[PDB]
Amino acid sequence: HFEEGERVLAKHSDCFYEAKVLKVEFKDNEWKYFVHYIGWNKSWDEWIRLDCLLKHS
């Protein structure tokens, strides 16, 4: 699990991008994370699932 404001790696297409978690939600027995991709337009902000997130380090 991840927290609001946490720096994470987020998978988009084929690879992982530096990202920040903006919002956390739980619905239909699953966690979703609204992320912002660091150094990218706000327009790319999106909801992603747990299996597309990676902790740093």
Residue numbers in the entry: 51 to 107
Original paper wording:
MRG1 and MRG2 belong to the MRG protein family, with highly conserved members in fungi, plants, and animals. Members in this group have the same domain organization, with a chromodomain (chromatin organization modifier domain) near the N-terminus, and a MRG domain near the C-terminus. Firstly, via their chromodomain, MRG1/2 proteins act as readers that recognize methylated H3K4 and H3K36. In addition, MRG1/2 proteins bind to chromatin that contains tri-methylated H3K4 and H3K36 via their chromodomains, the bound MRG1/2 in turn stabilize the binding of CO and ultimately controls the activation of FT transcription.
H3K4me3 (residues 1–9) and H3K36me3 (residues 31–41) exhibited detectable binding to MRG2 chromodomain (residues 41–123) (Kd values: 0.8 mM for H3K4me3; 0.69 mM for H3K36me3). To obtain the information regarding the specific MRG2 residues that are important for recognition of the histone marks H3K4me3 and H3K36me3, we determined the co-crystal structure of MRG2 and the methylated H3 peptides. The proteolyzed samples were analyzed using mass spectrometry (MS) analysis to determine the protein sequence, resulting in the identification of a region containing the chromodomain with residues 53–123 of MRG2 as suitable for crystallization. MRG2 complexes with the H3K4me3 and H3K36me3 peptides were obtained, but the complexes with the H3K27me3 and H3K9me3 peptides could not form crystals under the same conditions, consistent with the ITC results. The crystals of MRG2 with H3K4me3 or H3K36me3 were diffracted to 1.68 and 1.65 Å, respectively. In both structures, the MRG2 chromodomain contains mainly four beta-strands. However, the predicted alpha-helix located at the C-terminus is missing in the electron density map. The tri-methylated lysine projects into the aromatic cage formed by the His62, Tyr67, Tyr87, Trp90, and Trp94 residues of the MRG2 chromodomain. The co-crystal structures clearly indicate that the chromodomain of MRG2 can directly bind to tri-methylated H3K4 and H3K36, and provide strong evidence that the aromatic cage of the MRG2 chromodomain and the associated residues are essential for the binding, the same as other chromodomain proteins. Consistent with the structure, the Tyr87Ala (Y87A) mutation in MRG2 disrupted its association with H3K4me3 and H3K36me3 peptides, supporting the idea that the hydrophobic pocket formed by the aromatic residues is essential for the binding, as with other chromodomain proteins.
